[PDB]
Amino acid sequence: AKKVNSEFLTLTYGALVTQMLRDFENAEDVNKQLERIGYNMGMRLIEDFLARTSAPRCLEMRETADRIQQAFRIYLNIQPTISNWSPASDEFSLVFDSNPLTEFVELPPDLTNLRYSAILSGCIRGALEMVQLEVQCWFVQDQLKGDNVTELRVKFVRRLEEVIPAGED
Amino acid sequence: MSTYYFVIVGQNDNPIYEKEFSTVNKELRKEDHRHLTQFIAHAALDLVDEHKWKTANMQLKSIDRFNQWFVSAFITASQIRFIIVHDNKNDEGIKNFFNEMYDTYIKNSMNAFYRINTPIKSPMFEKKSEIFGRKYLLS
Amino acid sequence: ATLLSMECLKTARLYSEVAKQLIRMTNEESDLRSALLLEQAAYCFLVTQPPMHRKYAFHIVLAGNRYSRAGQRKHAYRCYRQAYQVFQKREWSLAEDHIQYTVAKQAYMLKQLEEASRSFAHLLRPGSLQSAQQQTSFLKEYIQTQNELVKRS
């Protein structure tokens, strides 16, 4: 029954963001720790995303893109769209349509340096850590910032696994 | 005509946010009248306490009188007080007009940045106030 | 008639009624009789319950003007004092600031300056949205507190 309301989680997250900003005036630290907790969630979250689909780690990067894409539909019940691949064809752009945590939560223009929902941008980080595929991942257009629809840019950097599943570590 | 003027009285009884809906005149005297109407917000506060203990509904039509002004009081589940001072009443529309500003204030509520009696600063709510006032009261 | 009402309802503790009919009286019949009856009805309105001094305060100073106008000095002065004390009880310095500018006009000549000085000091123009006449007023407050500093130094 989805056992949650988008509003409910939105309230919890907004209150938490309020809490950090009340803790540290500088948005730099709130961004740091929010990406830290995004990493933290993304490590355990993949343990459930792989509890349903037993996809092989990475045959190709488009497989990773579709995996992370379906992840949000599993959790946040939104379908992102993958596009804008390089001639190198390793990176990509990913579109989040509607963000439950965002829904009518305005941000102070005196707080612009904050990356509000970057937890997801870090969750995939924490996710991509686990499968031994670290990634330079972040946003190029933010529906939060005033852009039309959310758009995160994924630059994969390097692998951590050999012909054995154990891989380098 | 009625010199409609809206004011917020917070949970902790401190005033929050005003919004004129009157014709343009006597603005220097309107500053003193704004002091007056904040005092009237306190007086409303006091009376509407017991008067809302008399009832259980959202709208308490009009309570206080000052020989030219009418005071219309709206109570919410947020126990906010939304007050209009106005020479001649327009209550029939403002019942659901208060309901709509209620819904907008809820929108602000989901914005966790806006908090308990935390004074209004968002342009969104200000432009909502402008469009709604030009709709019914300021008209 | 209203006074007998006052006393007899005071023999019933339900002062609320006579509070309301005395406050509806006191607007009229004079600008002086209106004033002392304003405070009569006012403190009586406060007899039933200590709080909700709000309109109490408002009309008692908006009658303290008339008290300075056409009243015997001890009663008008007890007006000013009790009104101002009621202000400080639940502070709200906004209109208290202008009435303390009046405190200053009676302090620039008679009363003590430091009270007006600190009153305007707590208003603290930036962040309190003062106006052109208010900035000039706190210039004059600087003048009065200059008198006070000079007399202290």
Next chain:
Amino acid sequence: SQSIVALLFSEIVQYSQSRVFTVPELQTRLHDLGQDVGTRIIDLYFVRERSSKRETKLTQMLLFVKTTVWKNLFGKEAEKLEHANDDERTYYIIEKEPLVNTFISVPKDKGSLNCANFTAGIVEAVLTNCGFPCKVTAHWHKGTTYMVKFEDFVIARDKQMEEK
């Protein structure tokens, strides 16, 4: 989903544990966050469930909150609402389902209280904004219960209203 909320809330709790050097005011942080969420939960759930209708009767408003907040937050309305006759200021709302243990929780050896306090703070904010300020304490009595302590002023207004 459930894992996302359960985890993410867990990081609220433990990041507070980071900024907090002891049990009790850690629990106080949990209470404060529950307040900051309930402070809008209240008037959201007002319109959509209470049909935008106020309940001056402490019993009726408290019962309706018991149904609504639990029905939408955690699905199952709390089992029982009780009033203690010895102390009319102090009533109980027992919720056998632990909302902390929905995300099965820490050993309560190094600590005592949990997300139970967070939902207790939610309840307390709902009460204090409904015009019924109160103290809501999570208690491991008969499992999860929330003891509610009404201000003598509030319960006195109630008793006076309960003079028909």
